[PDB]
Structure formats: C-alpha cells, structure tokens
Amino acid sequence: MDKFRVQGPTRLQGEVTISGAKNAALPILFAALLAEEPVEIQNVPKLKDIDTTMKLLTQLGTKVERXGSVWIDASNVNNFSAPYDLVKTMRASIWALGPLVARFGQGQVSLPGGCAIGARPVDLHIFGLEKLGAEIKLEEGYVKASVNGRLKGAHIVMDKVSVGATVTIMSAATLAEGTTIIENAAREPEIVDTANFLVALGAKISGQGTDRITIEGVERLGGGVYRVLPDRIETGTFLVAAAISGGKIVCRNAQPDTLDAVLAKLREAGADIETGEDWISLDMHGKRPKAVTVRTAPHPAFPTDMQAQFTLLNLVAEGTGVITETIFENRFMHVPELIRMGAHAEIESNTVICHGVEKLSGAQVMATDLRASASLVLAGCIAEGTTVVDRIYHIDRGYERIEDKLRALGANIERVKGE
Amino acid sequence: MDKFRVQGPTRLQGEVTISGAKNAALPILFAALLAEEPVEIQNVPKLKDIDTTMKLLTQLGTKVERXGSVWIDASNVNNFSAPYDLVKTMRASIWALGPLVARFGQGQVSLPGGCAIGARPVDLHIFGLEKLGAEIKLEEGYVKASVNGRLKGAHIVMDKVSVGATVTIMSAATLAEGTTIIENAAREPEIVDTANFLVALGAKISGQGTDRITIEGVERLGGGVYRVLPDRIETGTFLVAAAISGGKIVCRNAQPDTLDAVLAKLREAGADIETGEDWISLDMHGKRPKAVTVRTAPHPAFPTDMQAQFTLLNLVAEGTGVITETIFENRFMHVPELIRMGAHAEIESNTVICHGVEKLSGAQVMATDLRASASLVLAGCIAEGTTVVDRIYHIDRGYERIEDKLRALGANIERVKGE
Amino acid sequence: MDKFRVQGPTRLQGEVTISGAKNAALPILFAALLAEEPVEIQNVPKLKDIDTTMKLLTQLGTKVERXGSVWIDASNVNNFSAPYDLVKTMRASIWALGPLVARFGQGQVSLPGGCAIGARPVDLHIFGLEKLGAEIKLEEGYVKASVNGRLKGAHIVMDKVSVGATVTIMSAATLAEGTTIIENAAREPEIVDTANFLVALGAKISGQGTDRITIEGVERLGGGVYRVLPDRIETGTFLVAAAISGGKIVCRNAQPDTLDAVLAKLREAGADIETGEDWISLDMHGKRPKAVTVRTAPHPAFPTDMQAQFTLLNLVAEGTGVITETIFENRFMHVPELIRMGAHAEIESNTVICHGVEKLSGAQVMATDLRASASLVLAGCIAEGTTVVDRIYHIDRGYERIEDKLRALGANIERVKGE
Amino acid sequence: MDKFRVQGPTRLQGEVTISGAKNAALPILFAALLAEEPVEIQNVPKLKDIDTTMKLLTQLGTKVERXGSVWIDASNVNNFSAPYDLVKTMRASIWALGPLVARFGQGQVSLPGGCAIGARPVDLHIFGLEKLGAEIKLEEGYVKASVNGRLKGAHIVMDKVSVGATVTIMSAATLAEGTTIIENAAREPEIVDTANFLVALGAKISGQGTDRITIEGVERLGGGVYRVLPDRIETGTFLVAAAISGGKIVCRNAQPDTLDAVLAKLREAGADIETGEDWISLDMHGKRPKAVTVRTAPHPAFPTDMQAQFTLLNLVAEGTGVITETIFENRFMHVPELIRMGAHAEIESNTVICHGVEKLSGAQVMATDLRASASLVLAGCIAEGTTVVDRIYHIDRGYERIEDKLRALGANIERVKGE
C-alpha cells in the first residue's frame, strides 16, 4: 500500500505545469468514436482511467496510441459491446453507448450488479437515448440501444442536472436527424470542452456552458487535432499550495477563466494574483493567508471540488472563517485528520468553523476523497516534522505525479511502501 | 362543460354511504389478470377509469361484467397488448404489465409521449420488473416486458416510495419462483387492499401496510369473492362537509382505521366523533369549527388528499390555522378561489396561514385539482348566496354522484350544462 | 379599486428612465439615523413605503423633506420608539432599531402578534444586536434594545443568509468600538449600495457584495449627498417589455452590472444588447423572442424577482422553455391567468413548462404578487384585444407610475378609477 | 486518558439490566423545581450530567441528595440563577428556566457565547416562554425570564419539532393560568415520561406522545415518588450486541413499547425476539444477521441514536444493506474506524452502503460520538484479536458502567488508564 512521507515545514514556490483535465479527456475520448477520420487528442494526462478507456476503445476495433497525445483512429469500429471486465472499474464507460448507437445503429454496455431501483446513474443516459429515437433493451446487468438509420433530434427536459447524461445526449445528437435541445444541461467547463471538441469535428453545437445546449445534427464528423483543457481543480490545488506556505507560484498551461470564483476567493485571502491567457500567478509575499468565508455552489460559483483545499487554507490562516457546503452532505470526513495535525475546527451541520493556527504537526493520516487526500499532502508539506499520508492511490487516480510536481516546488516528499 | 350551481347557506346533515375506493379497485382489477378461476370484485364504484379498465380487460381476452360488483374471468387471456387507444386517458394502465409477464411471459403497454427524463412514473415499474428477471424493451411507443419461464424472486430496495411500482412489483412477485422482498414499500390502505386480494387468490404476502413487503411465489392463483375497501378521502370529504356546516353525519360503508390522522384532526377542530366496525359519526353540535394545524406526510400520517378540504375548514374556523404541504409542490390553487369567497390567508413557502372567518360569500370559482374542486363545492354549500363551480368533470371522475350525496344532506345544488 | 385597461397589440419601443431602488432607498433612509449632519438622498422613488418611512422618521424627531430627493436632518432625534401602526404596514420598520441603539444607546419597535415560535423575521436582527453588546428586552409585541455606551464589535456567523439582518448588523456596527465581521452576509446589490452610503458618511466597511463583510467602527458619521442605485428589477421588466414586443428600447439611469444574469438571459432569447456607463439598450429587430431555460438562484445568479416576466417571455416565444424555481415555493400562482389569455403551459413540481404561442388574447385578469401583476400588464400590451388588469395597487407599491412609462413606450393603457 | 481494551471474538449472551434514561431523568429533575413537597426520583443512572444537575439545583437553594434515587426538596429555593460554572458543561441547563419563572416568577440561566446566530438551540425555549407571557431579557451570556403573577396559557405552534422546547413549554405551562396547547410537539418517550412525572405531581396533561399536547394549568404541584423510564438506546445497544454475535440476551427493566422500530428492524435481520411487560429477549441461534435497510426519522420511527449500532450490524451481516441518515448531517465518523477493522463500506451522500463481511480484525480505534464509540467497543467484542478504543469518556457520559455489563455477557474487556 503506497504512502506519502512528507517532511515539513517547507515553502512551496516556483513553477508547475498543469495537466489536462481528466474530466474533459474522458468524454472526449469516448466522443472520438464518432470521428470517421484519424484524431489527435493533446494534453491527455497519464491516468488510470485514461488507460482503461484506451483498452475499451481497442476492444471496439479502434486503433489507439499514446505518448502527451492520445492518437485515435476510429474509421473502422467493429465491436459494439463494452464487456464487464472492461467497464468494471469505470462508470464513465457508459459514455461508449451514445456514440455507438448514433454512428452505428447499435451499442451495448455492461452494467454492475446493483441493489436499489430508481434514480440510479445510468438512468438519465438510457432515457436520453430513448428520447432520441433509440430502442432500448434492458436486462439486469446491461443496457442495449439500437436504431434503424439515424437518431431523431428531440426536445429534452432534464429533471435532474447531470454532467454524465449531458455528455451522452449531446454526443449522440451530433449525428441525429434534426435539432436537439437539452434543457437543464450541466454547465461545467468540461461540458464546454467536450462540445468544442465535437464542433472541431464538424458538429453544430451552441449554448454549451449555459442551461440550454442546442444541437443541429450533421451527416458525419471528421478528424483533427484537439487540445484538452487544463485541469481546473489541479490548478486550484497548486494555487492553495503557495497560498498556505507564504510562497509564490506560477501555473503553466492553465485557463484562468475556468476559475473566476476560486481566484476571487484567493484574493479575499490576501493573495497577490496575476493572469495571462494561459497562465496564473500567486504571491503571498511571505505572508500568512487571511481567513475567508466560503459557500460552495453549482458552476460557475465556488466549486465543491476546492472545498478540502480551502478548509486547509482557513486552518492555517489568520483568524476565523466558515466553509459551507450548500448542496452536498458529509463533505468533512477529513477534518478530524487535520485536527489530529493540530488544527482548530468545529464541524457543525453542513459547515466547518475554522480557527487558524500557526503551525501544524505531522501525523499518520488518511482520507479516501481525492481532494481531501491531496489536502492532507499539502498539510504534510507545511506541518512541523513528519507526516505520513496513507492510501495515496486515491491521489494517483486524479493527479499526474503530484510528488514530482510538489518536489520541484521545494517539497520534502517521498513515495514509501508499507504493509 | 358541466358546472355546479350552489345556493347557501345550507347545513349539511344526515347520512351518506361511502363508495369503494377507485384507487384500490384499479390495482385490484389489474391484478385479476393473474386469476385462473372466475373472480367477483364487490363494492366497485361507477367511475370513468373503471370503464376504461373493463374495456382494457375485455381486449386482453377477459370476460368482464359489472352491475355493484365487477365479474372477471381471466382463465382465457389471449391478447397481450394495451394499445394507445385504450390507455391514452389512463396512467393506471401500466398495471396490466406485471400481471401479463408474470402469468403469460409477455406483456406490453402503450406509453403516452413526454419530453422530460427523470422522475417519470413508469421508471420504477420497469426497474422492479427487471429486478424480477424480466426483459424490458422501450420501443414503438410501447414498454415491453418478457420472460422465458417464470419470474425470479428478488430482494428489491426502492430508492423512492411508489404506490404504483409497489403494486406492480408485489403483483408480479406472487407468481415468481422464490421469495421477493420489497424495501421501502408504499404503505397506503390501497396497497394493503390489493395485497389482501392477492392472498384471497392464494398468494403468499405479509408486511402489507409496513415499509417491508415479503412475497412468497406460488404456482398459480385461483378465483374468489373480494370486497374493495371504502374510499377514505371520500369519507373525509363528507366528514368535513358536516364539520364546517355545524351538522351531524353518519358515514355508512366506511372503514375507521384508514382514517386515524383525519379523525384526530377532526377532534382537534372540536368534532364529537364516534366509530363502529363499518361506520363513522361526526357531530358539530351546531358549532363552528376550531382552527387546527396541519402537516401532510406519508400514510399513515395526514393525507395530502385531505389538504384542500382542511384548508376550507381553517377558513371558516375560529382562530388562525396553519396548513403545511410537504408532499406536493404547488398544491394551493384553491386558496385564491377561496379568498374570492371572502376568505383570508397568506401563502408562505409550503404553508398557508389561515384567518378563519365567520362566513363565506358566493362567487364564480374553478379548480383543476379533484380535491380543491370538491372543496369549492363544499364552500358553495355554506356560503351566503350563489356559487358557480366550473369544470366539475374533475369531480365526476373521482367522486360517485357527489351532487346526489350532497342533496340528500340538504344541499341546494344543480348541474348546469352549457356556456 | 384601481385597474388598468389595455388595448393590444402594441410594440413597446423608445426610452424609459429607471427609478431608484425601493430596496436600497429603505435601508439607506433608516441608516441616515446615524448621520450627525444633514443628508441628501437622491433618486428616491415615490412609493408608499417611502412615505411610511418618512412619517416614522419624523416621529423620532428627525427633520424630513422630499421632492426627486429626500432631505434628512437627524441632528435632533429625541423619541426612541416606533409605534404600533407604523410597523404594521411595513416590515422595513425594524431597520430603525439598530441605528437607534448604536447612536443613542436605546431603541424600541413594535411587534405584530406572534404566530409560530422560532423563524420570525425580527429574530435575526435581535440576535445580531445582542452579539454587538446590546441588551434585549422582549414581550409579545415588544422589542427593546439598549446599551450603556458604545456597541462592541463582534465576529458574527449567520446561519441563514438574510438581507434584513445583514443591513441591521452592518449599520449598527459602524458605531461600535472594534471590528465586526459578518460571515454569510447577504450579497444583494442593495446591500452594496447601503454599505457604500455608510462609507460615504465616514464608515469603514469592506467586503460588501461578498460572503464576508468587515466593519471597523468609528466615533461618528457626518452628512453628505448620496444617490440611490437604479431599480434592477424594474429595469428588467422594461427590457422584457421590448423583448416580448419585437421592439427596441433604451433604459436610462440604469446600472448594467447589477444585471449580468438577466442580460445574458436576454441574449439567449435572441436579443441584441448594448450597454454603457449608465444605460442599457435592447433591440429585437422586429423579431419574436426565442424560448429560454431559466433557473432562479441566489445573487448574482438569475433573480427569482424576474421570474414571472420570463415566464411571460417564454409564453410568447418561438419554441418551448422551462422555468425552474429553486428559490421560493408557490411562485407560479399567476400562470392560470396567462392560460386564460391563450397561453400554453404546464406547472410541474417547481417548474413551468412553457410552450410559446404566437399571440395572446386579451381578458380580465389579476395577480396579487408585485412581479406577476406587472407581467399581466406587459401581456395586455401584446395581446390581441382589450385586457383589464384588476387590483393594480399591488403594482403601485413597487412601480413608480408604470402606466406613464408604458404609454411613453407606445402602449395603449388607461388607469380606470375603481371601474 | 481512559481507554477500553477488548479481546475477541466473543459471543455476547445472557442478561443485562437496563439503566434509567438520562434523557428523561434530566428534564424530570428540573421539573421537580415545581414541587412544593419532597420528591423521590427513582432509577436515575449515575452519570456526569446528573451530578451537574444536582450541583445546579443545590445552588438555587434546593436540598438535594442521591444514592439508585435522587431526592429533591425544593422548599428553600431562594436563588433564581444558573451560573456559567455549571451550564457551561451542560446544555440541558436551559431546563431550569421554565420551572423557575413559572413557580417563582423569575429565573435566569447562563448562556454559552459564540459566533453563530439563527438556528440556535435555546431560541425555541425563549420563544415558548415569551408565548406564555414571560418578559425576556437578553445579553450575550445570559437569558432572563420573569412574569407578574402566573404564566398565561397560550396556543403555541412549533415551527420545528424540538424536544428541549417541548419540555420547557409543557413544564412551565403546568403552573400557568388557563390552557396551553403545543402543536407539532416532539413525541419522544422522554417527553411522555416528563409529562407523566408532572401528572403524578398533580399537573393536568394529555396528548403526550402525540404531535399535540394539552396542559390545563393548576395552582400548585405536590410531591411523591417517580420512577424514570428505561434507557431505550442502551437497550437497543444491548440487543445489537447479541444480534451481531449469535447470542441470546434478555434485557431486564426494559420497556418494549419505546422500541417498536428497532425491534421490527432486528426481526428483519433474522432475530428471534420476545417481549413482556418489562423484559426483552433476543435470540440469534448462533446465526449470523441479515443485512437490512434503515432510514432514520423522528420518534416513533427509527432512531438516529441507533444508527452507528446498525451500521456495525450491516458490516457483519449477510449481504448489502443501506443506512440512510436524515436527522443528523455528519454522523458517519464510525465508518472509517470500522473499515480499519476489515469492513467493506461505501459512503454516499446521506447514506452508507454496507458489505457484510464474515469477520472483523482487532485494531486501535476512536470515535467522538457516544453511539459510534459504543459501536466500536461492540466491534472489538466480535473482531478477531485485540482492539483498543480510545477516549471512552464519551461512553462514560451516556452509559452506566458499560464494561461490567459487557463482562457479564461474556466479553473480554478492560479499562486502561491511559498514556
């Protein structure tokens, strides 16, 4: 079981290059199934899910190769079924369904053994495909969709806001006959990125990033070169790393505009921030951060994905600050871990009241949440002494070699083994 | 476009005989598709939906006759499809699905068109059936279900309480192989009645009325005689009629136990109430009702179907009353209509603050909801002058000759045809 | 009982000069109680609530005179009580409490007979004052606040975002000794305006408009001249008027920045929009608006106060649009009135599914809500025939002579006295 | 720092005598302040809060002593104030307030400060009292209540269901002039017990246990002997200890009727349960438990206080089961500890997905929650090996000598005196 052994305190400063967003790379990789011609996908991070997707794609008869880029040749897809062994570790695999049916007339995706019926994950996807004219075949453990000729554009009202189903519906709609309208579409920057990718292939989409996405179907999608957008959360994590260590950092390959709320929040903490079209700088001037008030909410408001990081900021800031999770429940599992590191906090209902302390103390900590986990690693960086973060495979799944990035920032960090 | 012209004030007093519950008769009529031997369903009301169901049954090859009872012989079911023409005006038609697949191995029901995905009623039916081993197809405007051989008992956890899917799952499970357990089952008296009916046929069911129903599959269901339970909302509607008019009333062919919360509310309003095995008496002793606080919630608690009726009550009651709706959104349409009759109230969020007035005044009113509509008719009876309740077809569909029942109570009411 | 007789259809086009916001004028008027030197408040609308506030102020011993401006001389305040009548027709009256205590050491405002313990508007104000060092005295219908000397700055965390309490705490905090931090402060443009007014008097306030307001108390506030900000919702009502009428309009005395979400929403409807330092232009180019998807949420997202207006827009737009209310409950009560005008709509849960039709048919209509009411007048302007909007006094409360404005835009409208 | 050491696995069987409910004892000791004659309170557990209450009472001038009983003589009560030195460590202190002002005409309770306002516990108590005619005086750090003569009966609508405020209102109302009615009253067995205590003193109360309590005020309360009801949660914890271990336990000095939901759930898990007037027997027959579906809700529904206990049950039961928590927000702290013990569980939103493993592994654990902690100790009992549960002082505060009880059941437990 891999662990991170950090030795602090250390000032995090310098430069970091931001990896592509896993959350944009995935839907785009599945969308490449629509491409009749070779496709080059740039800025694709080296992550477990990316590997799983490549295998899945190959299993369908797609020609796949990688490095920074992922080269895809789907001119000839022959197998329209995603098997159990291949979708078992990845829910995103459902993304193969829509492209398959829209372009080939048929698709089949294996489903896991479940328990409760009603409002499940796959649900929105299946019904979205059904509104598009797909015939659905359901049997415990799998979903099959098929259509005679082209899908038919339709007017769709989403009762629930779903990032997943929005990608599925928007993807399959690019080849449908007519216009498709999606009401209550997820607004995430990743949805915008996926739509832009499609448009680069010849798709006709508008409204991406708003509550209403409109798609005019076209006969076919071509090929090309496409650059995946920067990882916005990864970027936020690095900004916070400098903000909590009285450091100065510059983020390369970033996209300032996917972070309005986070940047504004950082300024409130007294951070000196600068942006360029593709870069972001943060300077504390050796100064300790000021506590802030945070209310997480749906994009483009302050993201829940930055929550753990900001809680950390408040925990070592000057003063008292409160963090409120307005949509999500039980998002504070990790606070007791920080408290064990010498933090002063109180979890109350859907909030965390933060009392800033001068210095943290290393400890043996652990968290299952990717973000919370990453925050523990940041804590280890500035705490007095030795910190050991257990089960970092969580971090490995969403961050492209964070230890190396942290090390170049001046961190004393080692990847160590353990029983 | 029928209307009720009412002239008040009139004290509502005397006797009324309660009709069988439409909502228990429907699921029961459908479940009869499982019976191998002739069956007699007693106490079935004469309502539009019953007619639509009989016709549906006839089309499936069922021999159907009616008067008070509805006679069914489904020994020779030979057709397995419920077409658009026969199910357009009736959601309940989905109930033919489970019995067909469980007994015959195949079944299909026409699905009315719709544009929203998620929250769709039929969703839970499909899922329960799939859990039981059925193959589900969403094609040709139809929802299709089939199984090779017998359904297979399963442990089903409902993500949401659904009266409809509880009935579908429960019904089909009686013929499945093995044991079926439904977690988070709807508790409604209509559900208990349907269960009791199944058992009378030879089914093995327990837990009906609680959140956990257990079904022991058997090889076949027989025939028999079964009496549909009384309409609790109808009973409550008549009780309130006397409670707001200073009257005394005896409800015949009623079932006290399905009305716990409503009876307790009536006592708080100051009503003198007595009960027997199959009757309920309410005596105002010539007195004006007292205001009460109402919080709707799932059965066995206060029913949302009695909400508009109780609002009416608070409106002519002594004091200030509070009505809180936790079940439906937008269930206050009756209020603006009532206010036009001289009532006083404020709608704040999901609650109505009632300022009881001594007397109501006649006016031209209209509500699309069944309960609110019957409430308007009641208000017409006690209001000074003439009231014209428009669009009464809503009431015709859910109440068995309400005008006749009201007249026998002392109401001055006439059905006007034209506009 | 005033009413509007409208003759349609008429293209609304031209110019309208936007009134100051009642919602910012009120808290500023109350805040003037802090000023030791005369104060000039410009751009104050002529509305009932302003009068009540004026009467209330005079009663305290304040020198008050009005026009476009309101002159206040709070140099000689001697009465410290807000009598029963003044507070009964106006919740805003609670705003006199804070300045009184903060400046004079004593204050008292009447209380309307209680309803349900816990969750009264007045409560948050009370607790905030207490946090500031004030002694509170209560009894059914009475609230006295007092302190010996200065109020004391405190760290206050709001468990409920409240526009009212934020104003109270902020206002009173300008005179306290020390720093006051308000966590979870309301973000409204009106809060920003009030804070700005305070700063113009010599107060030290930062963070206005964000989740955290920090006030540094000072010995005293002088006098000066302050211009109340433009009415954001009126501005929006006018923008919609043109947008639903194929017209072109220019809003003068406007503040584009308080309308981001509404402006971007208008662009989605197909509108051509330009903005300047103090104006906003909208041009439909003779075109019918496009159906939009709306989601009301906390400022700066889409304002629930623009809801009815947008529902109207979708009702006469090309296509279907769904308006989703995440704010209040029961916000669609006016829709039936629109249906009576020939509109096509379905109310489902917390949403309205709008099916735009080509033209509205005039009729006799009425809504109690301010916004929904104004929307009915807009409808009369574009409907074919004559429309009579009843009970327009509701409109008069938040709209400065709307009939004159509409007429100046080309509307055929008459204020018919009583009938 | 006290700790618990457990050697497992060990079948928990035999008998246990249930302690009196701390939660009933507390409000009852406070209500005794209303007694004009001596009172003997039986079956009071020996816990910290009881000691604090005793100290509090003595300081008011009450003659107090304890053993199994607590003897109260409120004849010389000459001091009407509860100082911070007491209430600081005990929230229930607010309970002295109502009896004080109701009997003596005056009462003052010290209040813990804090940043947060709105949604504060004590708010409902203040409001109820005010409804009864009391004058309220506030200042950060204290709440004072007084009245001229007797309190006055009033009709009170609880905005929210509050156990504390229900006791306060009910208690004070017993000496009020006239009739008091509490709408939306908390239903807890602890409230029923306090009402019964009051009635034995001569008060006039009814509806206790339902959502509506009626209190007819009387001149004065006498004295007597009264036995505190059994601790329902303690009994639940004991039943679970047997259910998760193939054992057979009989709970003595119990009250079956206070545990409906828990008993039904245990049967759901496959337990052979029998009950009598004052005993409860559970028999697993050496059998492992069956996973169950659990949804916490207000009494008489499933208790949140049995939550952690049931999760442990699931974690070692056959299959998958889901615990959904709707009362408290962050009540999942016990899960990560259980995982360390070899348990398979996924946390999702307000629910926990359990994966029944055959056996747990000894380990070093710690939970701050009274219930979660007790759960861990239970875990240690059946887990293979040695387990060390830290900070068992939480358990000490709510459970009367848990080790002796467990030891008598077959457990291998030792108290360890820290560091």
Side-chain angles (χ1 to χ4, degrees), chain C residues 231-374:
Chain C
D231 186 333
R232 73 207 164 88
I233 306 300
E234 174 191 34
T235 294
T237 306
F238 289 114
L239 300 171
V240 164
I244 63 174
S245 67
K248 168 184 191 166
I249 182 174
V250 177
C251 297
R252 306 288 180 182
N253 290 16
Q255 195 181 322
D257 79 3
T258 66
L259 301 153
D260 307 324
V262 174
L263 301 188
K265 190 67 58 193
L266 290 166
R267 298 166 165 133
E268 299 167 25
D272 163 37
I273 299 182
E274 294 182 58
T275 69
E277 177 186 36
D278 59 17
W279 55 273
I280 303 166
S281 74
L282 185 161
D283 196 353
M284 300 307 282
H285 301 288
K287 293 192 188 63
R288 191 181 159 197
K290 298 287 183 174
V292 301
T293 298
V294 174
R295 311 179 94 253
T296 68
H299 184 82
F302 189 104
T304 186
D305 303 321
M306 290 296 309
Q307 174 275 313
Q309 311 85 307
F310 281 74
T311 290
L312 169 61
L313 171 166
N314 279 357
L315 294 170
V316 301
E318 302 190 301
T320 292
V322 171
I323 306 282
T324 289
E325 187 77 66
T326 79
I327 312 293
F328 303 98
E329 278 197 53
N330 294 284
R331 290 207 57 162
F332 312 122
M333 309 181 74
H334 77 292
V335 170
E337 302 292 78
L338 294 165
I339 294 188
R340 294 178 42 242
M341 297 173 73
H344 297 159
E346 304 85 49
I347 294 306
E348 276 172 51
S349 180
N350 68 331
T351 71
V352 191
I353 294 92
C354 314
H355 305 298
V357 302
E358 174 176 42
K359 193 166 59 178
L360 296 177
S361 306
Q364 308 174 75
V365 303
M366 194 282 291
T368 63
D369 177 79
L370 182 66
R371 319 299 180 185
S373 184

Side-chain angles (χ1 to χ4, degrees), chain A residues 155 157 159 161 181-184 210-212 265 268 291-295 314 320-324 351 353, chain C residues 155 157-159 161 181-184 210-212 265 268 291-295 318-322 324 353:
Chain A
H155 189 87
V157 175
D159 295 14
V161 175
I181 291 164
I182 304 176
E183 301 193 73
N184 307 305
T210 74
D211 315 274
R212 181 187 185 110
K265 194 58 62 179
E268 293 173 24
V292 298
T293 299
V294 185
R295 309 179 61 80
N314 273 357
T320 294
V322 175
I323 309 276
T324 295
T351 74
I353 296 59
Chain C
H155 188 125
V157 171
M158 317 258 268
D159 300 313
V161 183
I181 289 153
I182 298 173
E183 304 202 54
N184 304 303
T210 72
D211 299 301
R212 174 191 292 227
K265 190 67 58 193
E268 299 167 25
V292 301
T293 298
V294 174
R295 311 179 94 253
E318 302 190 301
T320 292
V322 171
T324 289
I353 294 92

